[PDB]
Design a protein around this ligand. Structure first.
Ligand SMILES: CC(C)(COP(=O)(O)OP(=O)(O)OC[C@H]1O[C@@H](n2cnc3c(N)ncnc32)[C@H](O)[C@@H]1OP(=O)(O)O)[C@@H](O)C(=O)NCCC(=O)NCCS
Ligand SMILES: CC(C)(COP(=O)(O)OP(=O)(O)OC[C@H]1O[C@@H](n2cnc3c(N)ncnc32)[C@H](O)[C@@H]1OP(=O)(O)O)[C@@H](O)C(=O)NCCC(=O)NCCS
Ligand SMILES: [Zn+2]
Ligand SMILES: [Zn+2]
Ligand SMILES: [Zn+2]
Ligand SMILES: [Zn+2]
Lengths: 308, 308, 311, 310
C-alpha cells in the first residue's frame, strides 16, 4: 500500500450554487453520473451531498439519497462518503439522518464550530444568480457552521455504532486539537482519516505555510495513527493536492470544492479534476489507490456492509 | 519606543470561577484593588470584566462597571481595556453595552465564532465547586462563543464611533484571516493590536510551533502595521510571554488567564504575575512600557477622553 | 507579466560528477552521450541544461576546458536551451581547476556554490560498492574527508571573474547558511537581481529532503530576498520528483536529471534524462502550469542571450 | 522529576573569535580566565566552556600546557563542569585541536559537527581602527577561513576522546550539522543523551531569526526525539533573546564573552558573571531554576568532576 494515493472526489456539495456553473451536478442522475465518471477516472472515494431538483438548493433528507447511493453502488465499488455537514446553516439533528440511516463506510465529521463566509462569491456571481435563495444564502454574514464538543461526541457515538468511520474535516489548528481530545478519550480509534481543509473564509488559508502547519500539527498529535488528506478550496485545489501527494498524503478534488479547471475556464466534469490529480500522482511515480486499497488504508468495513 | 514591552493584565475574566481560587477578584473593590496593584507593578493596560457580587458569576451589565472604571482611573493612568467578550455564552447585544456606553480607549474584539470547552476544568475542580451555576457552566459541552462576520462588523462600526480601538483576540489562524478581511475593507485602521491566544480548548494550542505559526501569519498578512501581543493560557503564561518578548512582541498576564504561580501554588495577586513578566522583560535588557508609551504604540485616544 | 505567469523552468542536469558509471549504464559519459542527453532533454521540455564533462576512458569527472569543447557547440547547434556550465566540478576539486571552463566559454549561466561543506558520498556504498568496476570509484565514494571548498574569498573571486564575462549565476544553496552567505554578497552589490537561487536537498553534508527543510529554505529566501529572486529546487535521489512538485505548486522552478537521481520510478532506473523531464512536465501540466521555453527562461533570469557566449 | 524545570547555563568565558583589542574585558591571561570561570560559576553557570590564549599577544593557544594553569585552578575553587574546546581557533588542524581534551580527559568537550566557512571580517567595520596586533588584523581579515570538521575528522575525535570517558557538546551551526550528527548516532559512535547545541548568528552558519531557532529545534526533535538535551548559543546581540526562547521551550542556554562582548546599548560587558546573572534572571522569571553542576552532570550523563585528569 506504499505509494498509493487515495483520490476523494466531492461531486457537488452545498457551498457552490447552480447559477455559478452549468456543470455543477443538481439532479440525482447528474450526481450519480458525476460520481460514476469520477470513480472510473480513479477516485476511490466519492463524497456525496444531494440537492432539490427544483431549485438546486441543498437537500439533506434521508429520501434525497435513495436515488443516489444504490445507483452508484450498482455501477462502482467506490467508497461512498456521506456528508454530515450538509449546508452549513443546518442543525445536527437534520444533518446526521442520512449517515445514520444508510450506515456508510465513511461519513464526514466537521470538527469545530466556525464562521462560514460565502459573501466573497457575491462580487463575482451576483449578476448571474437566477434564484433568490442563492442571493440570500451567499449574502448571509451570520452563517455559523455548528459543531460543538457535545455535537461531535453525539455524532461519533451514534454513527460509530453502525460501523461508520469518519473523514475528520479540520479547517484550522483548533480542529486537530479538538480531535485529539476525542482520540485521547477513546471515542474514535485509529487509523484516523484526517482531512485538512484550506482556503475557506472562516477557516485557515491556503498558503504553503498553512499546509505545513496543519501537517506538522497532525504529525505531532497523532504520530503514525492517521492518514492525511487535503482539500484546497477553489484555485488552490491542485497546488495543495500536489503538496500532499509529494508529502505522503492523500488528495480531494471535485466541483464541491472548486468550479475551475484553469484561469477563466470552468471544469466541465468531476472526472476532469480526478484526471488532473491522477496526472500529478503518476508523474510523481506514485499510483492512485483502488477502492479496495482505500478500504485497507482506512480500515473501512467494506462496500457490502452498508445499508444501501 | 524601541525595546518597550507592553504588559496587559487581565485581572478576573469570566472563564475561571470563584470556587477555583479565593484570590480570583469578585467584588468591585477586589477588582479595582487588583487593577491598581497590577498597574503599579508595571502593567500599562488593564483588561476588565465584572462579576455579580453575590455568587461571583459574570456580570456584563453597564451598571456592573460603574464602581470599577472611575475608581481605577482616579488612582492610575493605566489604559483600561473593557471586554466585549463577557462570558462566552452571552449574545453580542449583551456583550457590547459596557464599551458602547463608557467609550473606553481599548476594548477586546473576538474575531471568530468558536467552541469554548471548560469541561476539562471540571476534572480538577468539580469536588470543590460551591455554586450550582459553576457546575452548569463548566459542564456545558455546547458553548458557542459567537462572533460572526456580521457581528464583528457591527461591533467595529458601533464602538469605533466612540473613538474606541480594539485588542483583536485571535484564537487560531482563521481569526487572523478574518481580521485581514476587515482590514482590507477599511473597517479598522492600523496599527492593529493583535492578541494571539494560545492553549484554550476550542482554540489553537500552546506549542512553540503554534506561537510561530500565528506570528508568521500576522507578519505576512499585516506587515509593519500591527503590534503583537500573546496570551498563554494557564501553565503556558510565562513561557509564551517570554517567547513574545524575545521576538519583539508584547505580553498579557493575569488571573483571568492563569490561576497558578507554580506547580501546586495559586497566584495570590495579579501584580505578582506582572512582576514575573517584568523580570523576564528586564532580564532581556528591555523595559516595561508605561501607559503613555502604550497609548503611543497603539494610537489610543487618551485616558481622559473616555466616558468615566 | 502575462507571457510569464505560470511558466515553470525545468533545468536538466544530465550527468554531473557524483554518480559514477558503474551505478547505471544510462549515466552519460562520452561527449556524444552527454550531447545526446542534453538535446533530448531540451526537446522534452528542459529550458536549461546543466553540464559537466567526463573522461571518456574511465568515466571520471573531467573539468578541463578541452573536455567541454566537443559538448557546448554541438548542443547549441541543435537546441536553443540555456547552457549552464558547472563551476562545482567534482567536490574534491580546487577553485583554480573548477573556474576555467566558465571563464573561457563565458556562458549565459554558471553554477556558483555558496559555502564550504563536507560532501559525503559514502551513503552510496551500501547499494553500489560491490558493483564498482573502477578503483577510482571505490576511492572516491569511500573518501570520508571531502571538503567542497567555497570560501567567502573564493565566491567573491568567482563572482568578479565570471561576472566580467556577462555570465549570471545559479546560486547553489545546500543549507540556510548559504542563503545568508548570498545575502552578504547581494548587500555588497557583487551580484544583481533577479537572483537565480537553487536550494539543494538531500545531500550528505547538506540539508535533508524533509518537507520542513524545503519550507525553511523557501521562507528564508523569501525573507532575505523578497521579490528579487527566482527559486529552483533539486531533490537528491528518490526525493527528486516530490521536491519538484512542491516547488511547482509553490511558484518555484525545478531541476531533474541523472546528475541527481538515477531512477525513473519504483524498481526502474531512468534510461534517459528526457524521461525525467517528461515526468516533471507531467506534474507541471497536471497543475495547470506550462513549461518555460528557453526564451522565457532568459527573460525570467535576465540572461545575456545564446548569441553572446564564447562557443 | 526533580530535574524538571532546571536550566543549565553554560558560560563560555573567552573563546577564540573575539580578540583582545575588541574589549579590555575579554579574558586573556590564565588568571583572568580562571577568575572569569569562577565568577561565572558562582553567579550560577553549571558548565564553563574553556579556551586558552597566549599571554604575550592574546592569540588563541590550544597547547596542552596552555590549560595547565587553568583547569586545576578552577576545579579547586568550583565544582562546575569544565567543557574543553576541540574547536580552538577555526584555522587550526584537528591534530592541534584534539590534544588538550585527549590529555586532560574532561567530562565534556565541544565537538563541531561540520566543515564551514567562518567569516570574521564583518567585525573589521566596528573594530579595525583599534586593533593593536598584526595577528588580529590578518585573522579577522582572512576571507578564506575553513573551520575543518570532515566526516573522517569527527569520527576520529569521537573514537579518541570517547575512550577517555569524555562526552560531547555537539556544536551544530546549521541544519546539515544535525543531519551529520544523525549519521553518527545511527552508527552507534555516540550514545544518548546527546547534548546538542545549536549555534545562531555566525557568518558562515545559520542566522538568529526566530524562524531559524524553531527550524533547528524541530529538526533536532524529529531526528533525535527524546534522546537529547538542547542548548542554544545566540551570537552577539541575540544572546539573551535566544537564551529566553530556549528556556521557555525546555532547552538550556549558553552565555559568555566568547559569544557576545556587549551588555546593552553601547555598553561593553564587564564580566562573564554579568551575563550569567541576566540569563538567571530570565530563567527565574519563568519560574524555572538554574541547574547546579551535579544536576547538569545527571542531565548530561557525565562521568563526574573527580574522574578527570586534572
Ligand atoms: C541520494 C542518493 C545517495 C540516492 O542514491 P540511490 O540509492 O541510487 O537512490 P534512492 O535510494 O534515493 O531511490 C531509489 C529507491 O527508491 C525507489 N524509487 C525511485 N524513484 C521512485 C519513485 N518515483 N517512486 C517510488 N519509488 C522510487 C527505487 O525503487 C529504489 O528503491 P529501493 O531502495 O527499495 O531499491 C544519490 O542518488 C545521490 O547522492 N544523488 C545526488 C547526487 C548529487 O549530489 N548530485 C549533485 C547535486 S548538487
Ligand atoms: C556577532 C558579532 C559579529 C557581533 O559583533 P558586535 O558588533 O561586537 O555585536 P552586535 O552588533 O551583535 O551588538 C552590538 C550592537 O547592538 C547593540 N546591542 C548589543 N547588545 C544589546 C542589548 N542587549 N540590548 C540593546 N542593544 C544591544 C549595541 O549597542 C550595538 O549597537 P550598534 O551596532 O548601533 O553600535 C560578534 O560578536 C560575534 O561573532 N560573536 C560570536 C563569536 C563566536 O563565534 N563565538 C563562538 C561561537 S561557537
Ligand atoms: Zn461536503
Ligand atoms: Zn477577557
Ligand atoms: Zn552540477
Ligand atoms: Zn568555544
Amino acid at each position: 500500500l506504499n505509494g498509493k494515493v487515495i483520490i476523494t472526489c466531492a461531486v457537488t456539495g452545498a457551498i457552490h450554487t447552480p447559477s455559478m456553473s452549468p456543470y455543477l451536478p443538481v439532479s440525482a442522475s447528474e450526481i450519480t453520473d458525476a460520481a460514476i465518471g469520477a470513480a472510473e477516472a480513479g477516485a476511490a472515494v466519492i463524497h456525496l451531498h444531494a440537492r432539490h431538483e427544483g431549485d438546486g438548493s441543498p437537500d439533506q433528507s434521508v429520501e434525497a439519497f435513495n436515488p443516489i447511493l444504490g445507483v452508484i453502488k450498482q455501477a462502482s465499488d467506490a467508497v461512498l462518503n456521506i456528508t454530515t455537514g450538509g449546508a452549513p446553516t443546518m442543525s445536527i439533528a437534520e444533518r446526521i439522518q442520512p449517515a445514520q440511516h444508510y450506515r456508510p463506510e465513511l461519513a464526514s465529521l466537521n470538527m469545530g464550530t466556525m464562521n462560514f463566509g460565502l459573501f466573497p462569491m457575491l462580487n463575482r456571481y451576483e449578476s448571474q444568480l437566477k434564484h433568490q435563495w442563492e442571493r440570500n444564502y451567499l449574502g448571509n454574514k451570520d452563517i455559523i457552521f455548528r459543531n460543538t464538543f457535545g455535537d461531535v461526541e453525539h455524532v461519533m457515538t451514534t454513527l460509530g455504532a453502525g460501523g461508520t468511520r469518519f473523514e475528520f474535516e479540520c479547517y484550522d489548528t483548533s480542529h486537530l486539537y479538538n480531535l485529539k481530545h476525542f482520540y485521547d478519550r477513546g471515542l474514535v480509534k485509529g487509523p484516523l482519516f484526517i482531512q485538512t481543509v484550506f482556503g475557506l473564509m472562516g477557516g485557515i488559508g491556503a498558503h504553503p505555510d498553512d499546509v505545513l502547519h496543519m501537517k506538522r500539527t497532525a504529525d505531532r498529535l497523532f504520530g503514525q495513527d492517521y492518514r492525511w488528506s487535503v482539500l484546497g478550496a477553489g484555485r488552490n485545489q491542485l497546488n495543495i493536492a500536489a503538496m500532499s501527494a509529494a508529502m505522503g498524503g492523500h488528495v480531494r478534488v471535485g466541483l464541491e470544492d472548486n468550479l475551475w479547471a484553469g484561469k477563466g475556464r470552468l471544469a466541465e466534469t468531476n472526472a476532469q479534476q480526478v484526471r488532473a490529480a491522477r496526472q500529478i500522482v503518476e508523474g510523481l511515480g506514485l499510483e492512485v489507490a483502488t477502492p479496495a486499497e482505500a478500504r485497507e488504508l482506512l480500515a473501512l468495513k467494506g462496500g457490502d456492509q452498508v445499508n444501501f
